[PDB]
Amino acid sequence: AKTIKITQTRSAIGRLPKHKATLLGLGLRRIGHTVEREDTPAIRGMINAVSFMVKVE
Amino acid sequence: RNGRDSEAKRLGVKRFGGESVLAGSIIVRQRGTKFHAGANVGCGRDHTLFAKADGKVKFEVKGPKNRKFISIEA
Amino acid sequence: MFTINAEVRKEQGKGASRRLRAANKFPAIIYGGKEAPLAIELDHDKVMNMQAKAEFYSEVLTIVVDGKEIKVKAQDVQRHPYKPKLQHIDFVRA
Amino acid sequence: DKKSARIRRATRARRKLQELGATRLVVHRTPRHIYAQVIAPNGSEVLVAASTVEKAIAEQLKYTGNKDAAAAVGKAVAERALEKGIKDVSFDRSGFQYHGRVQALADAAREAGLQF
Amino acid sequence: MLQPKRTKFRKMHKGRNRGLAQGTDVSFGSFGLKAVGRGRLTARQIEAARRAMTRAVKRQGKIWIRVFPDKPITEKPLAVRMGKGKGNVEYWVALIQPGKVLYEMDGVPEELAREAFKLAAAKLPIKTTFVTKTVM
RNA sequence: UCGCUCAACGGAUAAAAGGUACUCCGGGGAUAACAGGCUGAUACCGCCCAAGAGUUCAUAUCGACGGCGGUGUUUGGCACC
RNA sequence: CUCCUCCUAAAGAGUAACGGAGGAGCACGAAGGUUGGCUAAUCCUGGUCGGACAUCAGGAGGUUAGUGCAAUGGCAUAAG
RNA sequence: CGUGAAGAGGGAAACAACCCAGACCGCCAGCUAAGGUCCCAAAGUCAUGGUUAAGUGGGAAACGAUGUGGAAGGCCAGA
RNA sequence: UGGUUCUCCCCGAAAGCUAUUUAGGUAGCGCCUCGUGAAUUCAUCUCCGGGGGUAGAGCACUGUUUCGGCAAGGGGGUCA
RNA sequence: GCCUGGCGGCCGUAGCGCGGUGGUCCCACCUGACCCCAUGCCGAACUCAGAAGUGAAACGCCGUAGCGCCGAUGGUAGUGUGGGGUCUCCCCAUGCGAGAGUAGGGAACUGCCAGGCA
Numbered sequence: 001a002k003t004i005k006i007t008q009t010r011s012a013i014g015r016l017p018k019h020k021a022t023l024l025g026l027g028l029r030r031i032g033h034t035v036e037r038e039d040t041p042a043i044r045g046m047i048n049a050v051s052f053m054v055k056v057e
Numbered sequence: 058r059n060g061r062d063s064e065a066k067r068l069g070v071k072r073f074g075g076e077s078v079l080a081g082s083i084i085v086r087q088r089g090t091k092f093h094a095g096a097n098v099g100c101g102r103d104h105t106l107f108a109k110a111d112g113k114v115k116f117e118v119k120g121p122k123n124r125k126f127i128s129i130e131a
Numbered sequence: 132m133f134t135i136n137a138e139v140r141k142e143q144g145k146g147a148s149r150r151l152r153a154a155n156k157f158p159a160i161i162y163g164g165k166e167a168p169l170a171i172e173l174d175h176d177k178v179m180n181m182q183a184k185a186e187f188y189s190e191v192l193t194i195v196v197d198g199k200e201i202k203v204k205a206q207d208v209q210r211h212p213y214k215p216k217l218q219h220i221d222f223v224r225a
Numbered sequence: 226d227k228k229s230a231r232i233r234r235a236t237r238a239r240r241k242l243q244e245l246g247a248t249r250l251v252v253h254r255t256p257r258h259i260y261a262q263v264i265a266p267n268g269s270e271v272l273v274a275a276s277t278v279e280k281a282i283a284e285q286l287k288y289t290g291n292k293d294a295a296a297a298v299g300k301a302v303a304e305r306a307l308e309k310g311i312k313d314v315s316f317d318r319s320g321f322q323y324h325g326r327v328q329a330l331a332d333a334a335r336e337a338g339l340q341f
Numbered sequence: 342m343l344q345p346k347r348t349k350f351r352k353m354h355k356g357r358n359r360g361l362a363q364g365t366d367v368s369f370g371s372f373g374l375k376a377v378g379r380g381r382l383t384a385r386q387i388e389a390a391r392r393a394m395t396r397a398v399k400r401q402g403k404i405w406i407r408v409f410p411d412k413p414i415t416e417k418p419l420a421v422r423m424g425k426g427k428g429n430v431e432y433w434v435a436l437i438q439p440g441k442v443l444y445e446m447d448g449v450p451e452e453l454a455r456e457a458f459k460l461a462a463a464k465l466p467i468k469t470t471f472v473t474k475t476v477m
Numbered sequence: 478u479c480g481c482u483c484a485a486c487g488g489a490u491a492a493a494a495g496g497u498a499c500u501c502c503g504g505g506g507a508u509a510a511c512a513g514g515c516u517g518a519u520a521c522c523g524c525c526c527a528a529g530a531g532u533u534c535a536u537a538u539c540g541a542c543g544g545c546g547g548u549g550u551u552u553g554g555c556a557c558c
Numbered sequence: 559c560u561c562c563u564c565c566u567a568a569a570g571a572g573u574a575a576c577g578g579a580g581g582a583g584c585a586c587g588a589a590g591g592u593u594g595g596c597u598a599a600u601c602c603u604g605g606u607c608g609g610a611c612a613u614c615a616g617g618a619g620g621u622u623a624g625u626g627c628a629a630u631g632g633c634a635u636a637a638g
Numbered sequence: 639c640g641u642g643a644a645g646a647g648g649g650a651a652a653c654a655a656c657c658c659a660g661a662c663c664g665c666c667a668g669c670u671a672a673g674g675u676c677c678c679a680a681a682g683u684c685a686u687g688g689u690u691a692a693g694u695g696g697g698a699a700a701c702g703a704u705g706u707g708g709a710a711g712g713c714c715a716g717a
Numbered sequence: 718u719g720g721u722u723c724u725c726c727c728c729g730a731a732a733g734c735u736a737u738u739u740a741g742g743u744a745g746c747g748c749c750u751c752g753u754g755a756a757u758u759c760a761u762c763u764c765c766g767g768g769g770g771u772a773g774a775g776c777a778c779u780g781u782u783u784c785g786g787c788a789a790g791g792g793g794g795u796c797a
Numbered sequence: 798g799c800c801u802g803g804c805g806g807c808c809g810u811a812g813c814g815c816g817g818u819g820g821u822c823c824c825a826c827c828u829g830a831c832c833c834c835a836u837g838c839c840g841a842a843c844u845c846a847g848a849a850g851u852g853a854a855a856c857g858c859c860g861u862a863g864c865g866c867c868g869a870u871g872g873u874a875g876u877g878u879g880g881g882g883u884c885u886c887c888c889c890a891u892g893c894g895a896g897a898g899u900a901g902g903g904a905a906c907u908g909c910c911a912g913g914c915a
Contacts, residue, residue, distance in 0.1 A: 010671080011659055014640055016878085018761075025761040031659090031671085045762045048892080052879045059426070059578060063562045068631090069570060074767030085768085089632025092768090096244070104632080116767065121808055122634095125768090140871085146890070148872065155707095160871040163900055168870040176708050188477045207899060208477050209872060212361045212440025213377040213470065219872045221899065227825085228856080230842090234595080237635035239804095253803055255824070257848070260803060262909075268805045271909050278802080278823080278911050291846065292833090319803090322594075324834065325844055349780050352578060354566075358885070360773080360874075369784060379885070389543035396528065409782050419519060420553055424576050445784095463526035464543045466700080482583085486560040489738060504718060507741060525701055545700040569771045573734100595843090622778090644730085699884105773875045774896040 001038035008033050010053035022049045072108075074116045082108040084127055095119075097129035133181055137196040140170035157217050161194060161201055164224035171196055179217055182208070191225050231320030238318055243268060247315040250302065250339065252327045254319075257290035259326055261302040263311055273309055275302035295326035299333025312340040342384035343410045344433050352427055353413055362441035367474040369405050370445035372454040374461060378468040381434040382443070384410035390461035394444060397457035402448025408435040437467055 008028040012020050026046055027035045037043050047056055068086045072078050084106045085092050094100045095117070097110035108114075112131035119126050140147075140158060148158045157175045162168035171194065181187055182205070192203045206221035242249050246266040253260035262274040275298050276282070277289045282301055286294050306314070321327045335341065358379060367373040387410060394404060410433035417428035437443070444461065446454050455471050462469045 013659060014657090016639070019878085021761045023761090032669095040763080042761095042763045047762090049762065049878080051891085059580090060559095060576075061562085061581085062564085062566095065572065067571060070768050071571095072767095073570085075765085076767080087632085088630070089637095091631065094244075114767080119808085123808065143871070145873085145894080149889085158872065162870055168900085170871060180709055185476060205477065207872095208475075210365075210475070212365050212438075213375055221871075223900065226855085227842090230596090233597095233634080235635090240635055249804085251804070255802085256827095257821095258802090258823085258911095260910085262803065264804060264909090269908065271804065274803085274910060276803090276910070280911090288847070290848095322834090322843065343782090345781055347781080350579070354578080359887090363774085383543095386543060392542065393526085393528080403784090405784065407783070411781065416518085417554095423554070427577065460526075460528095462544095463701090466544060468700090484560070484583090485738085486583105487736065505741090524699100546698085567771095569769050570767105643732095772895105 001040065003036055003038050004043075005057045006035050006037055006047060007055050007057075008053060009055045012053070015053075019050055019053075022046050023054075026050075026054070028054070072114050074114050076114045078108045078111065078114055078129065080108050080110050084108055084114055084129075091125070092116075093120075093124050093126045095126035095128035097131070098127050133184075133187055133190070133192045134200075135173055135178060135181070135192060135194045137171040137173055137194050139197060140172055143170055152216075152218070157219065159220045159222060161203060161222040161224070163206075163222070166224075169196070169201075173220070175217060178220070179215070182217065182220075192222070194222060234320040235318065238320075242315055242317060245315075248272070248311060248313065249317045250314045250331075250334070251317040251319050252321065252330055254321050254326055255290070259290060259295045259298050259330065261298050261330060263302065263306050263314060272311055273302065273306045275305055290326075292326050292329040295329040296333035299330040300337045302330075303334035303337035303339045307338055312338065314339050314341060316341055342388045342433075343406075344384060345409075345411055348411075348413070351413065352415055352430060356412075356436070358436050358438065360438055362438035364407055364442055365440040367442060367445055367472060368407075370403060370447035371474050372446045372449075372451060372458065373442045373472045373474070374444040374458045375470050375472040376437050376441040376443050376467050377439055377470050378437075379439050380437055380467050381412075381414075382408060382410065382437050382465065382467065383414075384433045384435075386465055387435065390444070390464035393460045393464050394446070394457045397460045398446070398449050398453055402446060402454075405445035407442045407445060408437065410435045412436060442472070443467075443469065 006026055006028065008023065008031050011031055012023055026037060026043070047054060066086070068088065070085045072082060072084045078084065084098065086103075086105045088104065090100075090104055092106060094106050095115070097108065097112060098106050099109050101107055106127055108129050110129050110131060112129045115128040115130050117126055117128065118124070137159070143158075151158055151172055152175075155175050156172050157178075159171045159173050160168055161171060188205050192205065193200050194203050201222075202225050203222040204225045206223045207219075208217060208221075209219040210217055239249075248266055249262075249264045251262050251264060253262075258277050260274075260276040260278070262271045264271045277286070277294055277298060282294075282297055283289065286297055288294060306312070316323075316331050318327065323331070331341075358381070362376070365375070387406060387408065391404070391406060398404075412434045413430040414432050414434055415428040416431040417423075443465070444458065446457070449457070451473070458469075458471050
């Protein structure tokens with residue numbers, strides 16, 4: 001793929017249970033943790049679900 | 058003067074559209090019709106529609122009164 | 132007599148049209164006729180001091196937009212619920 | 226309002242033949258003619274049909290539209306279906322009382338062979 | 342005061358008062374008293390402002406009340422606890438959104454109306470403006 | 478298959494009311510009275526509008542119908558100590 | 559104080575309060591089965607008594623009726 | 639639904655529940671979050687533009703008041 | 718009701734539902750833990766298939782509500 | 798290829814009004830009912846005989862927008878997620894986005910027999 005890089009900007013403490021599952025499906029364990037996920041539209045929708053707390057490059 | 062209600066009857070759709078059901082599976086429990094029995098589906102005495110045949114659940118408006126039917130398609 | 136400057140709407144929607152109103156313009160539409168509907172933007176306090184006349188709603192108007200004058204009639208006006216501000220105008224071809 | 230009453234009687238008997246998926250022998254009666262079709266379990270289009278309106282069964286008859294004419298169609302629609310391989314047909318009254326000409330037509334198809 | 346002659350139900354829920362009003366144009370008269378705030382207009386307030394308008398125009402020109410008090414507000418007696426069922430219906434309000442035309446008027450000159458709608462606005466708990474009829 | 482207002486309706490027994498200021502014990506601020514708190518419907522105080530009263534004259538004085546606040550001074554609400 | 563219907567109840571189910579309204583503790587050998595029919599309320603007009611209304615006849619209307627008993631879901635293929 | 643319960647840390651002066659963030663241990667290392675950067679007290683007496691004159695900021699309503707953008711009105715033939 | 722005595726490591730609740738002579742007790746379930754099994758089972762997102770009647774809105778229905786025109790019928794002085 | 802009839806698909810852009818129109822081809826009333834049959838009374842209906850009449854009613858087809866019905870575009874409402882302002886209640890970013898109403902559409906469209914010139 002193009003394999004975008006996603007990193008976690010904020011934390012997952014006070015968040016919805018559906019938001020924490022989306023960070024699980026991306027693989028983000030903590031703040032600053034970057035991750036290397038492929039560029040499918042099912043990963044674009046995972047990013048958009050938590051775009052307030054992830055930063056894509 | 059008030060204070061009484063009854064137990065909730067757990068009505069409504071039990072198998073939605075596109076779900077694969079066995080025969081005899083209850084598809085909707087209802088009081089009136091509000092959902093009529095199309096192909097491969099019986100009405101039942103309390104109007105509980107149920108799958109007469111295995112297949113997928115299919116809702117469609119059909120008829121001269123725009124009534125919602127439920128077919129079953131194998 | 133009434134000649135209105137207009138610009139074409141680049142973005143339509145809710146937050147787009149709330150930005151036009153906060154930036155002292157307001158959206159409009161020119162539908163009607165053969166051609167497709169034409170989403171436009173007018174400036175508010177120039178049209179607001181022009182629709183206070185009774186003949187803005189009576190005679191044919193002239194909306195100039197990007198090199199085109201379209202003979203129009205005002206058709207329906209959404210105003211603000213309580214402030215003396217317009218929110219939309221419908222124009223029909225004439 | 227003769228037709229508006231008759232299609233009201235048929236439209237319960239037309240169902241339980243769509244929800245059953247049965248081949249419908251439908252009979253249409255009228256003052257001077259008598260009609261019959263055999264229609265597939267689908268609601269689409271007929272398989273065989275017979276009436277007195279065809280000129281084959283016109284001057285083979287003393288009169289069109291009586292019970293001896295309905296027994297002419299009764300042999301006619303049945304003998305033309307068995308050559309296509311259609312039996313186990315279901316009779317639709319189509320709102321008429323199963324008594325007169327339409328009894329005489331279903332009786333003369335049961336002799337000629339149509340499994341009801 | 343205004344009140345429905347009958348209702349199908351004695352008590353209503355409290356509800357909420359979110360949104361903007363639907364009757365926002367001067368429909369019948371020439372001059373209007375539009376509500377720009379949001380709250381509840383009890384039938385005591387609607388009547389007190391109906392007299393204050395009518396007395397200012399000296400019984401001249403037609404007057405429309407475009408709102409109606411159709412919500413039964415209950416109120417528990419003093420020194421009674423919480424619970425023990427909903428309290429007893431004591432007055433009737435109209436829920437008022439921003440943009441509601443409260444009153445309307447024609448048959449008077451406008452400066453007599455803006456005077457009379459200023460006397461009514463001091464009887465209401467809701468900030469209000471004076472609006473006149475618009476073609477479209 | 479029958480017999481249950483076992484209706485306190487998952488039915489303590491076949492069969493069951495009270496008094497206690499003579500009282501007792503085990504607990505509770507899980508819960509009341511007092512006071513504190515929170516809240517202010519009520520109460521009290523102020524203000525807005527001005528119909529009117531005041532010989533004329535709304536605003537010297539008073540102020541109907543209605544409006545908005547303050548106080549924490551009552552009667553309460555609550556049940557936090 | 560058990561049961562039923564509606565709302566609260568947040569468009570699946572469920573969901574509390576001494577929340578808001580109502581009902582049940584049966585009836586029926588036909589009011590069940592089936593088969594063959596049928597289609598209402600109200601209104602107008604006509605008018606033997608007969609009046610707003612008995613019955614009859616037409617027109618309108620289209621279920622505003624009816625559903626042994628609450629309310630809701632239904633009901634013309636009628637479940638009437 | 640989130641946090642507390644059963645979660646310490648930073649901020650909101652203090653302040654279970656709010657905001658930031660989830661403490662394995664050590665370090666006299668670094669970058670940040672919310673919050674902040676005159677002094678108490680770590681960091682801008684930052685840069686450019688505007689506003690306000692009340693210590694507003696740093697508690698409050700109806701209402702009152704010449705505090706400080708677009709038009710409208712009757713004149714260098716005099717407002 | 719009060720007390721319950723050495724240490725590390727791993728995980729980690731609930732204060733709900735239903736019953737209860739029950740409501741500060743208990744029981745089944747829910748959630749916790751340990752163990753043994755099993756399926757691309759589970760979650761997330763995208764696309765598809767669904768059913769709604771909530772928010773909104775609306776006023777044909779059920780009620781309620783103004784105002785206007787009402788072809789009424791006739792209160793009402795009124796005539797006889 | 799129009800015309801009619803059965804059965805359907807479809808379910809108001811298909812309905813209704815209003816106007817015009819069609820005959821033994823078909824369909825409708827219509828002739829008669831003595832019997833099969835049947836009306837809580839009526840051959841009205843159902844049903845059976847058989848075509849003298851008429852296309853009046855019905856029923857098709859063709860007109861007309863009077864009425865329904867359909868109905869964008871834009872805007873508004875609401876709202877998921879995120880962050881803000883404060884009695885209530887909103888606003889920003891982003892995603893989804895009505896209802897109502899305008900413009901306009903619209904006098905339905907379609908699979909078997911029979912009839913008559915082809």
